[PDB]
Design a protein around this nucleic acid. Structure first.
Ligand code: URA
Length: 223
DNA sequence: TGTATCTT
DNA sequence: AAAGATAACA
């Protein structure tokens, strides 16, 4: 119980009774019986437990969870102490250090600090079979995360979406590019970071857009 | 050994 | 689809 934060469950509950969702949860359940799936069930929706849905100001959309033991916990790119930051996160910190002058490696990989500030740390696909990246794509997660993006698009204003990677970028078409700001770059994984993530300056750019629309910027060092 | 994106 | 090529790093 209580895997979903109250305000999130209230606005996404309409998906629960849909065939694709019932079949999606059915698939993940069958998978957990034969393989190790990440993150654990009680953490698949951690991204709804950090702030009220109406308080989201920035959305970071990744591809799918870390596929190693004890890494993924429901917030994209984040890992709970004492787990060391995986390759993707070390790259995010590397960019943050050159993008934000006051930013220095926090010495851990827990990104709850950002989420509590209204930064939704979402992935297009919310589960993954151990050691197999994007193994759970096209099973129904995409329509669910589409519902999340769609609600935010219609009920919020001036949000800043950071779509990292081709899969996250599939959601760009559902975002009113006039009402919200969409920043797109390569995924921070070592296998693609060199295609543009380094130098993208999305963190400083995100705050410029927020402050321009009179909103409090994100303190990226607040972790 | 191990962490995307484009092409056939 | 899904496998192969291409691709930084350590
Ligand atoms: O949560 C995560 C971690 C790495 N890469 C992603 O796309 N998401």
């Amino acid at each position: 119980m209580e895997f979903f934060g109250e305000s999130w469950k209230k606005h996404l509950s309409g998906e629960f009774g849909k065939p694709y969702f019932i079949k999606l949860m059915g698939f993940v359940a069958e998978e957990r019986k034969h393989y190790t799936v990440y993150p654990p069930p009680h953490q698949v929706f951690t991204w709804t437990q950090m702030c009220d849905i109406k308080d989201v100001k920035v959305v970071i959309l990744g591809q799918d969870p870390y596929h190693g033991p004890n890494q993924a916990h429901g917030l994209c790119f984040s890992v709970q102490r004492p787990v060391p930051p995986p390759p993707s996160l070390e790259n995010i910190y590397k960019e943050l250090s050159t993008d934000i002058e006051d930013f220095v490696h926090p010495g851990h990989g827990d990104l709850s600090g950002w989420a509590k500030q209204g930064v939704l740390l979402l992935n297009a696909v919310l589960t993954v079979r151990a050691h197999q990246a994007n193994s759970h794509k096209e099973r129904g997660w995409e329509q669910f995360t589409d519902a999340v993006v769609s609600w935010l698009n219609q009920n919020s204003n001036g949000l800043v979406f950071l779509l990292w990677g081709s899969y996250a970028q599939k959601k760009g078409s559902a975002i009113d590019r006039k009402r919200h700001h969409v920043l797109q770059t390569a995924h921070p994984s070592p296998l693609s970071v060199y295609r543009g993530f380094f130098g993208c300056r999305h963190f400083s750019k995100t705050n410029e857009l927020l402050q321009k629309s009179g909103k409090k910027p994100i303190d990226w060092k607040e972790l």
